[PDB]
Design a protein around this ligand. Structure first.
Ligand SMILES: *[C@@H]1O[C@H](CO)[C@@H](O)[C@H](O)[C@H]1NC(C)=O
Lengths: 335, 38
């Protein structure tokens, strides 16, 4: 959302490209929802039964009806996600939320305002923010902190795994599964507490280190799917890649697709390489048809930005562990 | 305690749905608008 000023006002709320949802149960009896698990936000929100604006998009989704839950306890505090036009607005509510067996008592957003567009075409109902209280609108206790206080987890950590193909993937709560990765975990300390953002010393194309020299920041957003990074950086990277802008995405000729170089992200002193097969959608091989890379622009303003953002495609190759206890992000080669 | 798992199930993305419906990307409104993502 746009709102420069604060840390809980500049949140990458992508979802344009998001192929994976999870399920939560709110209330007594539970009311289920398809939710996007985003490490970029820290708020839990679902469409509310109290949403009524004809041009909103709540109509096309599952609504939370507080009246049908015995465990419901109201708050009423207004929360707003501001965009250029228009807004994602609602009010604060408290109820019993169940995620993968774990049951908690959560302060979530009952959304009464959703934009046009893009939400009608969203197959998911709401969002579950996996970030820290520093990014939470209204400073509300995020889902993970609430799970931590239950003392159910082995470790105060969670890890994301994106499957070989397509259930499609999974979030491991309380640790990281050894059947998901090979080798050892490389632990990178966070830049600042309150955001899943790490220091990056450089980005390489081919041989050959071109951009991100003299340092740069890199977010780890699970809600995202592509690799984000400032227009100027992506303009340099794409011109070196031999790709041209086709609007919202960058393309190459499907035949020259696998012939492309390798992108390398220097994180914590280690070489995080990404081959042509990882960042290119090879649906075709014809010299006439166009293949989407993406890797797209995305300009994030301060305090959050200027920053890069490593999405679901990075986590697909690199099994990521999110350590809330030790304030670090651990990467291991996925399998 | 035993390893709690959240199973991530495959869904069609907003971009994928727009392509399937044949929605012209340029006809979504001006640069300022901004088909919600940031
Ligand atoms: C809502 O919760 C907040 C704590 O985050 C508190 O400051 C406020 O007084 C609460 N309001 C009601 C009506 O319960």
């Amino acid at each position: 959302l746009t709102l420069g000023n604060t840390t809980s006002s500049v949140i990458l709320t992508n979802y344009m490209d998001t192929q994976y949802y999870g399920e939560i149960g709110i209330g007594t009896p539970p009311q289920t929802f398809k939710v996007v698990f985003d490490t970029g936000s820290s708020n839990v929100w679902v469409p509310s039964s109290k949403c009524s604006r004809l041009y909103t998009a709540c109509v096309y989704h599952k609504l939370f009806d507080a009246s049908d839950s015995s465990s419901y306890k109201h708050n009423g505090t207004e929360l707003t996600l501001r965009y250029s036009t228009g807004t994602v607005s609602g009010f604060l509510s408290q109820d019993i939320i169940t995620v993968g067996g774990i049951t908690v008592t959560q302060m979530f957003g009952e959304v009464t305002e959703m934009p046009a567009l893009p939400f009608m075409l969203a197959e998911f109902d709401g969002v579950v923010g996996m970030g820290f209280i520093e990014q939470a609108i209204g400073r509300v206790t995020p889902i993970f902190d609430n799970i931590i206080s239950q003392g159910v987890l082995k470790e105060d950590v969670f890890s994301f795994y994106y499957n070989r193909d397509s259930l499609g993937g999974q979030i491991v709560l309380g640790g990281s599964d050894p059947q998901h990765y090979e080798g050892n975990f490389h632990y990178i300390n966070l830049i600042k507490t309150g955001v899943w953002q790490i220091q990056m010393k450089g980005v390489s194309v081919g041989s050959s280190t071109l951009l991100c020299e003299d340092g740069c920041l890199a977010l780890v957003d699970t809600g995202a799917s592509y690799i984000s990074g400032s227009t100027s950086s992506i303009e340099k990277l794409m011109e070196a890649l031999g790709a041209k802008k086709r609007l919202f995405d960058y393309v190459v000729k499907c035949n020259e697709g696998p012939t492309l170089p390798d992108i390398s992200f220097h994180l914590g002193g280690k070489e995080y390489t990404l081959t042509s097969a990882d960042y290119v959608f090879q649906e075709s091989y014809s010299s006439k048809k166009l293949c989407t890379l993406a890797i797209h622009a995305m300009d994030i303003p301060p305090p959050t930005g200027p920053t890069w953002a490593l999405g679901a495609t990075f986590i697909r190759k690199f099994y990521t562990e999110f350590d809330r206890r030790n304030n670090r992000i651990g990467f291991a080669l996925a399998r | 305690t035993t390893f709690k798992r959240i199973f991530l199930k495959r869904m069609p993305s907003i971009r994928e749905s727009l392509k399937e419906r044949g929605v012209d990307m340029a006809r979504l409104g001006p640069e300022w608008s901004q088909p919600m993502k940031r």
